[PDB]
Amino acid sequence: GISVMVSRSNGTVSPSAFLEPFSADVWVMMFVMLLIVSAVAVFVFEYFSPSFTIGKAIWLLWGLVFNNSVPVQNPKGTTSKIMVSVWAFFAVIFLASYTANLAAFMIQEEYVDQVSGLSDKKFQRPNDFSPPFRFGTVPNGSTERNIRNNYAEMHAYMGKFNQRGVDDALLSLKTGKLDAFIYDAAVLNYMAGRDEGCKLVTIGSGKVFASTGYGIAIQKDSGWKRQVDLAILQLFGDGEMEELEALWLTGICHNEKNEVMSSQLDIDNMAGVFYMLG
């Protein structure tokens, strides 16, 4: 059929990844538990032995949950010292798990993907919104014929990127001159599985659009047409066909679990946190 292969786009883009550990339920209710316990200390420390009020009850109590290094004014009296101390034990665990889970969430990440299919607006609109997006195919073939009949709008624009053969197109991918290739599927999947670095992938993890098949052309109304097809069907039965492809059409770059090979995080991944103070 017809597929599209694009570069790995380096690591996956996973914005707003900071909030993924925990859930909105505990956060929306954990905060109010501080206010209650802050009030309790005012009742707890009201007696015995310097004006610790609700004004600084939060500031000391809010400091610990975010690690430490928050200059504060301690309370006084052995009556109340026990409460802030046992409150600290609640600070270590909340901190201990949150770190010990975000990484545990980040290891099992999933690859971001870029475009969905030929119906995407990026293909339909070549440069309407985004910077000029690049794609092309080898002419003379079959995929060009399908494109002309059904997608006449994008067939005019993509005329100035024609390649000449399968190999010469692949090099232009790595150099960044071209970043989208539309060619027959039975060749891309073999090629994308037997490349050094495993930096090339088919979108949709094996996505095809107009499903046809290969075959053996015979002269019109030939007497052989009744026997050739029966022979081929038999090769399915004994499994000969289903092990030959294990001999010519195998690779090493496994396309399973969507291996990310680190993220090498950048400005973009932590967009929200630079917004939260904003």
């Binding site: 610990l64 430490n68 301690n74 010292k81 101390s85 600290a88 034990f89 270590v92």
Partner: peptide, 16 residues
């Protein structure tokens, strides 16, 4: 009390 407090302080990471 300080000895009781000081030890219990560092492990739980409190400024008390």
């Amino acid at each position: 009390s300080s000895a009781m407090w000081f030890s219990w302080g560092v492990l739980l990471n409190s400024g008390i």
